[PDB]
Amino acid sequence: KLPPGWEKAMSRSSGRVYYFNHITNASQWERPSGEPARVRCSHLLVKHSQSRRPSSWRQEKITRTKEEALELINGYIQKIKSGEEDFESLASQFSDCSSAKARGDLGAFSRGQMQKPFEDASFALRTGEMSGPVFTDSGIHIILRTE
Ligand SMILES: OCc1cccc2c1OCC2
Ligand SMILES: OCc1cccc2c1OCC2
Numbered sequence: 001k002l003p004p005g006w007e008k009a010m011s012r013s014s015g016r017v018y019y020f021n022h023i024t025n026a027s028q029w030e031r032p033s034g035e036p037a038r039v040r041c042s043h044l045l046v047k048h049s050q051s052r053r054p055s056s057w058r059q060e061k062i063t064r065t066k067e068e069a070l071e072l073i074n075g076y077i078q079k080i081k082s083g084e085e086d087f088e089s090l091a092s093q094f095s096d097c098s099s100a101k102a103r104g105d106l107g108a109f110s111r112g113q114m115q116k117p118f119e120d121a122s123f124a125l126r127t128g129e130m131s132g133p134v135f136t137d138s139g140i141h142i143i144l145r146t147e
Pocket of ligand 1 (some may be wrong): 097098099100101102104105106107
């Protein structure tokens with residue numbers, strides 16, 4: 001019926017159908033369009049107090065709650081989707097990963113190298129697509145598949 005991981009849902013506020021991906025946490029109104037050895041992705045990471053390493057180049061001691069980190073991620077996604085901000089600009093300013101210095105770019109990678117939820121979301125994205133919030137032991141990620 002639909003590409004890997006997609007399902008139909010109904011908007012609670014408007015009653016219109018939309019589509020949700022349970023691997024990437026992406027959601028969109030339009031029906032999703034019609035696997036490679038490697039993908040290339042960028043990401044924006046927001047760490048929280050239960051992150052494997054609660055520290056980053058932005059903050060020596062990361063104290064925000066996981067719920068707070070999700071609110072921040074959700075707000076970045078809103079501004080990317082509206083065009084008020086670019087993904088690369090937000091990643092450079094606010095990602096708790098040191099890849100922030102490369103506008104979030106991680107380069108190319110294969111299966112078995114990244115943390116599993118990150119890997120699964122990366123490979124389920126189509127080229128150019130963005131994930132919703134993706135949870136790993138590092139924190140919460142927004143993932144952009146660039147190749
Ligand atoms: O693009 C990859 C990259 C650039 C800069 C810093 C880091 C990176 O990955 C781990 C930390
Ligand atoms: O390339 C992946 C990577 C991992 C860790 C650190 C750095 C990296 O790239 C620039 C600095």
